[PDB]
Design a protein around this ligand. Structure first.
Ligand SMILES: CC(C)N[C@@H]1CCc2c(ccc(O)c2O)[C@H]1O
Ligand code: NA
Length: 454
C-alpha cells in the first residue's frame, strides 16, 4: 500500500467519470429518471413516481434534489449492492474471483449500470473473461445493446477489460493539471498586463489623456478580475468545493458582477470616446474635461455596484428552486443560481446595452469616414482590421456567455453547468486581452519599453 498520490485505481473513481455527480433528478441517455451518481430511481415515466422512490430511499422530502453528502451515500450503496449481486449470482461469482483487481472494477461497473440479472446474460462474454480471453470478449462485448446505447462508456469499460489497466480513465487526470496550469497562465497574464497599464499612466505625463483615463478604469476592473475574481474561481473549480464560507461566496459573486459590468461598460465608454475624438476632434476637447470624464467613470462604477453588490448582498438575485435553496444553505456550495429577473436585467446592464452602443458607434465611425472631403487605399483596410479585432475579440469572449446567461433561465436543463462555466471563463480572458488591444499607442509602446528594460 502506502499510495496517496492522485488517481488511485478503484471502482469509485471509475464510476464518477462514467456517471458524473448531479444533485437534481435527470433523465439518463435512455430517458430513465436518475439522480446522484448513476442512481436509477424508477422505470415509471412520471416524475412524481421518481420523487416517491427518492424520498423513501433518502428518508426525507427531497423535492427531487439531494445534497452532495446524500449522493455519496447512495453511490456507495449502489456500489456495495452491485458487488453483493455479483457474489449472489451463479454466472458472476466464478468470473468475479477469476478476475484481477482492475478487471473486477470493470465487472462491477457493468453490474452497477445493469443489475446482477442483466450482466449475467452475457453468457459468452463472461465465458471468455473466465478463460482470460480479453481481446475476444472485447470484440464480443462491442456487439451488444449495451455498447450501442452508451458507446463512450462501453468503449472505456471494454478497454479496461481488454488491456487490464486504467488507460481508458487515467487520461482523465492529465486534463486536471492541464486545466490548472492554464488557469495559472490566465491569472498571471491579467495581473501582469493590467498592472503594467495602470503603472504606465500613473507615472508618465505623456499618457495622462482623457482617453487613457477610461483606459485606466478598464485596467482597474481587469486587474481586480485577475487578483480577486479569477483566483477564487480557479480554487473553486479545482477543489470542487468552496472553502471560504457562505458570506465570502456571495461577495466573491458580488465582486465578479462588479468587475464584468464595469469592464464592459468601460469598453462601451471607450468606443464612444474615440467616436467623438475621431469625428469631432475639436469639440471633443472643449466639452470633455478631465473632471467630466471622472464623473463618467463614477457613473460606470455606480451603475456597476448597483447592478452587482446591491442585488446580491440583499439576496434579491437568489433563485427559489430546491437546488438553489440547498446551495444557499451549504457552506461548501458556491454554485451560481439566479432568478430570471436578475439573469436578464444584469445581461442588459452588463453586456447588451454596451454591445448595442458599441456596434453602433464603431460602425458609424466607418460610415462617416466615407463622407469626408475625399481611393481604395491601404490604410482603410488597416483601420478596418483594427476595429475588427476591437469588436471581434470583445464579441467572441463575452457574447457566447451572455447568450447562454439568458437561455439557462428560459428553458432549464438546456445549458449544461459545464458549458456555462467555460463560456464564463472564456469571458474572463477578455481582461487579459484588453491591454493588448487598447494600449498599442506609440506613447504606451514606449512606456512599456522603459518600464521593463530600463
Ligand atoms: C457568478 C460568477 C462566478 N459568474 C458570473 C455569473 C453571471 C454574470 C457574470 C458576469 C456579469 C453578469 O452580469 C452576470 O450576470 C459572470 O461572471
Ligand atoms: Na452558499
Amino acid at each position: 500500500d502506502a499510495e496517496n498520490l492522485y488517481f488511485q485505481g478503484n471502482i469509485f473513481e471509475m464510476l464518477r467519470i462514467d456517471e458524473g455527480l448531479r444533485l437534481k433528478i435527470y433523465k439518463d441517455t435512455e430517458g430513465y429518471y436518475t439522480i446522484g451518481i448513476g442512481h436509477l430511481l424508477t422505470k415509471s415515466p412520471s416524475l412524481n413516481a421518481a420523487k416517491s422512490e427518492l424520498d423513501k430511499a433518502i428518508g426525507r422530502n427531497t423535492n427531487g434534489v439531494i445534497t452532495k453528502d446524500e449522493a455519496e451515500k447512495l453511490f456507495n450503496q449502489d456500489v456495495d449492492a452491485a458487488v453483493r449481486g455479483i457474489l449472489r449470482n451463479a454466472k458472476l461469482k466464478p468470473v468475479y474471483d477469476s478476475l484481477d483487481a482492475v478487471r473486477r472494477a470493470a465487472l462491477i461497473n457493468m453490474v452497477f449500470q445493469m443489475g446482477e440479472t442483466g450482466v449475467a446474460g452475457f453468457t459468452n462474454s463472461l465465458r471468455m473473461l473466465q478463460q482470460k480471453r480479453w481481446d475476444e470478449a472485447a470484440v464480443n462485448l462491442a456487439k451488444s445493446r449495451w455498447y450501442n446505447q452508451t458507446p463512450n462508456r462501453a468503449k472505456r469499460v471494454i478497454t479496461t477489460f481488454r488491456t487490464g489497466t486504467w488507460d481508458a480513465y487515467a487520461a482523465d487526470e492529465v486534463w486536471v493539471v492541464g486545466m490548472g496550469i492554464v488557469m495559472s497562465l490566465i491569472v498571471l497574464a491579467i495581473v501582469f498586463g493590467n498592472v503594467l497599464v495602470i503603472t504606465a499612466i500613473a507615472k508618465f505625463e505623456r499618457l495622462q489623456t482623457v482617453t487613457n483615463y477610461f483606459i485606466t478604469s478598464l485596467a482597474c476592473a481587469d486587474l481586480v478580475m485577475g487578483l480577486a475574481v479569477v483566483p477564487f474561481g480557479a480554487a473553486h473549480i479545482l477543489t470542487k468545493t468552496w472553502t471560504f464560507g457562505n458570506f465570502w461566496c456571495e461577495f466573491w459573486t458580488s465582486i465578479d458582477v462588479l468587475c464584468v459590468t464595469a469592464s464592459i461598460e468601460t469598453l462601451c465608454v471607450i468606443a464612444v470616446d474615440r467616436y467623438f475624438a475621431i469625428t469631432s476632434p475639436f469639440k471633443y476637447q472643449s466639452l470633455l474635461t478631465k473632471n467630466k470624464a471622472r464623473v463618467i467613470i463614477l457613473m460606470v462604477w455606480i451603475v456597476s455596484g448597483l447592478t452587482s453588490f446591491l442585488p446580491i448582498q440583499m439576496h434579491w438575485y437568489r433563485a427559489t428552486h430546491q437546488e438553489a435553496i440547498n446551495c444557499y444553505a451549504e457552506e461548501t456550495c458556491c454554485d451560481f443560481f439566479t432568478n430570471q429577473a436578475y439573469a436578464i436585467a444584469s445581461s442588459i446592464v452588463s453586456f447588451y446595452v454596451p454591445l448595442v452602443i458599441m456596434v453602433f458607434v464603431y460602425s458609424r465611425v466607418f460610415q462617416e469616414a466615407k463622407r469626408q472631403l475625399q481611393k481604395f487605399a491601404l490604410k482603410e483596410h488597416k483601420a478596418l482590421k483594427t476595429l475588427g479585432i476591437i469588436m471581434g475579440t470583445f464579441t467572441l469572449c463575452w457574447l457566447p456567455f451572455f447568450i447562454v446567461n439568458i437561455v439557462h433561465v428560459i428553458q432549464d436543463n438546456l445549458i449544461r453547468k459545464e458549458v456555462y462555466i467555460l463560456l464564463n471563463w472564456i469571458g474572463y480572458v477578455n481582461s487579459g486581452f484588453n491591454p493588448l488591444i487598447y494600449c498599442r499607442s506609440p506613447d504606451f509602446r514606449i512606456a512599456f519599453q522603459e518600464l521593463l528594460c530600463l
